[PDB]
């Protein structure tokens, strides 16, 4: 059926910038009567994905001046001329004038800013945890940027463990920031046999603690 | 004002059905085409239904054509779609749409309803507090934490002292692995306000009827 494409699938662009986001079809989609369907859509991180621009150009209720859908040729392309810290989320073009309505698969804005350094914190398994046979460190490694941050798990003093789960938030639209936690799940038996614990974000920022309890 | 209500989203067992809901409000129901539009786990959204404003004309893609099945009751103002024949393929986040009459296709949209077709079992989750050792300060603030691990479906609510604690807060989304995933949040507050008074972790698992408040102390 008609795909539409969107390039690029990620856009980090400065703040009060302008942005350009471009979907082209693999078919000719421009009606010759005053019906063609060619809408964008915003998810902000955690909602419904909202209306902004419908047949190809015009602008729906609410959305702000900023924003324009061009469009013409096979390359839809939406322009937001002021970025703003709360223009952050996902674009989708939705096609409709072809009956297999379909999707783009979507660009995630990304507001630039300065870099700055987690907030890492490490945290010792709860007793409850430890007591149903289970140990899971964990370390936060809140507000930094950019995302593109490392983090090594270090048992006594050298052990660099592997088996971690970590979790990354969307960027804030406050601040700009990323957060994220690293979760290192071992036994209460194999964490019972070792003493210190780190956490490393990579001049590293390193936190750990001792023992296996306090 | 004009407000759309999905539910009946839940965990399901491969070719099991079930039945979604729209309730819909501020304007006229019978006036208006109505849809439903999934989005994928990958965050990929897909078209899954149109109905006419009489209903009748209905408006199905190929993938779900003969297992889905979209109706409506303008007299209650409400939209519904017939899940039949699951696959894992199936399992999304399920909006539901309304049509802005010669405007645009999805003018207004839900909060949305997660289904889940899996042959997993409902877990309940295990709520962990978590705090610096010793009650360690770190400066003028103090970082507390919550670890929400081995829970299914998806489907879990975490907030700090009821709502009161929304500010510095940090739910970090939620990580499968081995059909059991695992949450955790952080909260900042100053020095002056945990070791006073005491912090509590709210966690609810609908899917096992799972509510528990961990106070975190040191």
Same mark, same amino acid.
């Given at each position: 059926?008609?795909?539409?494409?969107?390039?690029?699938?990620?856009?980090?662009?400065?703040?009060?910038?302008?942005?350009?986001?471009?979907?082209?079809?693999?078919?000719?989609?421009?009606?010759?009567?005053?019906?063609?369907?060619?809408?964008?859509?915003?998810?902000?991180?955690?909602?419904?994905?909202?209306l902004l621009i419908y047949?190809?150009?015009?602008?729906?209720?609410?959305?702000?001046?900023?924003?324009?859908?061009?469009?013409?040729?096979?390359?839809?392309?939406?322009?937001?001329?002021?970025?703003?810290?709360?223009?952050?989320?996902?674009?989708?073009?939705?096609?409709?004038?072809?009956?297999?309505?379909?999707?783009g698969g979507g660009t995630?804005?990304?507001?630039?800013?300065?870099?700055?350094?987690?907030?890492?914190?490490?945290?010792?398994?709860?007793?409850?945890?430890?007591?149903?046979?289970?140990?899971?460190?964990?370390?936060?490694?809140?507000?930094?940027?950019?995302?593109?941050?490392?983090?090594?798990?270090?048992?006594?003093?050298?052990?660099?463990?592997?088996?971690?789960?970590?979790?990354?938030?969307?960027?804030?639209?406050?601040?700009?920031?990323?957060?994220?936690?690293?979760?290192?799940?071992?036994?209460?038996?194999?964490?019972?046999?070792?003493?210190?614990?780190?956490?490393?974000?990579?001049?590293?920022?390193?936190?750990?603690?001792?023992?296996?309890?306090? | 004002?004009?407000?759309?209500?999905?539910?009946?989203?839940?965990?399901? /067992?491969?070719?099991?059905? @079930?039945?979604? =809901?729209?309730?819909? &409000?501020?304007? *006229?129901?019978?006036? #208006?085409?109505?849809?439903?539009?999934?989005?994928?786990?990958?965050?990929?959204?897909?078209?899954?239904?149109?109905?006419?404003?009489?209903?009748?004309?209905?408006?199905?893609?190929?993938?779900?054509?003969?297992?889905?099945?979209?109706?409506?009751?303008?007299? /209650?103002?409400?939209?519904? @779609?017939?899940? =039949?024949?699951?696959? &894992?393929?199936? *399992?999304?986040?399920? #909006?539901?749409?309304?049509?802005?009459?010669?405007?645009?296709?999805?003018?207004?949209?839900?909060?949305?309803?997660?289904?889940?077709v899996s042959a997993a079992?409902?877990?309940?989750?295990?709520?962990?507090?978590?705090?610096?050792?010793?009650?360690?300060?770190?400066?003028?603030?103090?970082? @507390?934490?919550?670890?929400?691990?081995?829970?299914?479906?998806?489907?879990?609510?975490?907030?700090?002292?009821?709502?009161?604690?929304?500010?510095?807060?940090?739910?970090?989304?939620?990580?499968?692995?081995?059909?059991?995933?695992?949450?955790?949040?952080?909260?900042?507050?100053?020095?002056?306000?945990?070791?006073?008074?005491?912090?509590?972790?709210?966690?609810?698992?609908?899917?096992?009827?799972?509510?528990?408040?961990?106070?975190?102390?040191?």
């Open positions: 059926d008609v795909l539409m494409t969107q390039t690029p699938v990620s856009l980090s662009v400065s703040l009060g910038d302008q942005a350009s986001i471009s979907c082209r079809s693999s078919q000719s989609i421009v009606h010759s009567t005053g019906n063609t369907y060619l809408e964008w859509y915003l998810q902000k991180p955690g909602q419904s994905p909202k047949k190809i150009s015009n602008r729906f209720s609410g959305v702000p001046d900023r924003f324009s859908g061009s469009g013409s040729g096979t390359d839809f392309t939406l322009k937001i001329s002021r970025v703003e810290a709360e223009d952050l989320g996902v674009y989708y073009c939705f096609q409709a004038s072809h009956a297999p309505r379909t999707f995630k804005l990304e507001i630039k800013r300065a870099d700055a350094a987690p907030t890492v914190s490490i945290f010792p398994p709860s007793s409850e945890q430890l007591t149903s046979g289970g140990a899971s460190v964990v370390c936060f490694l809140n507000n930094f940027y950019p995302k593109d941050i490392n983090v090594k798990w270090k048992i006594d003093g050298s052990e660099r463990q592997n088996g971690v789960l970590n979790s990354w938030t969307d960027q804030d639209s406050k601040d700009s920031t990323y957060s994220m936690s690293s979760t290192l799940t071992l036994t209460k038996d194999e964490y019972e046999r070792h003493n210190s614990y780190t956490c490393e974000a990579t001049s590293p920022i390193v936190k750990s603690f001792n023992r296996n309890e306090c | 004002e004009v407000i759309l209500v999905e539910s009946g989203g839940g965990l399901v /067992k491969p070719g099991g059905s @079930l039945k979604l =809901s729209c309730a819909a &409000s501020g304007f *006229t129901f019978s006036s #208006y085409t109505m849809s439903w539009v999934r989005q994928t786990p990958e965050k990929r959204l897909e078209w899954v239904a149109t109905i006419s404003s009489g209903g009748g004309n209905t408006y199905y893609p190929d993938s779900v054509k003969g297992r889905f099945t979209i109706s409506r009751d303008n007299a /209650k103002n409400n939209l519904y @779609l017939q899940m =039949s024949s699951l696959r &894992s393929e199936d *399992t999304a986040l399920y #909006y539901c749409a309304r049509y802005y009459r010669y405007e645009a296709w999805f003018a207004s949209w839900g909060q949305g309803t997660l289904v889940t079992k409902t877990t309940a989750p295990s709520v962990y507090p978590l705090a610096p050792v010793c009650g360690d300060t770190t400066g003028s603030s103090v970082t @507390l934490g919550c670890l929400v691990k081995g829970y299914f479906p998806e489907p879990v609510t975490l907030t700090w002292n009821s709502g009161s604690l929304s500010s510095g807060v940090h739910t970090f989304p939620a990580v499968l692995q081995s059909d059991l995933y695992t949450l955790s949040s952080s909260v900042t507050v100053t020095s002056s306000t945990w070791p006073s008074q005491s912090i509590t972790c709210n966690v609810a698992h609908p899917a096992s009827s799972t509510k528990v408040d961990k106070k975190i102390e040191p």
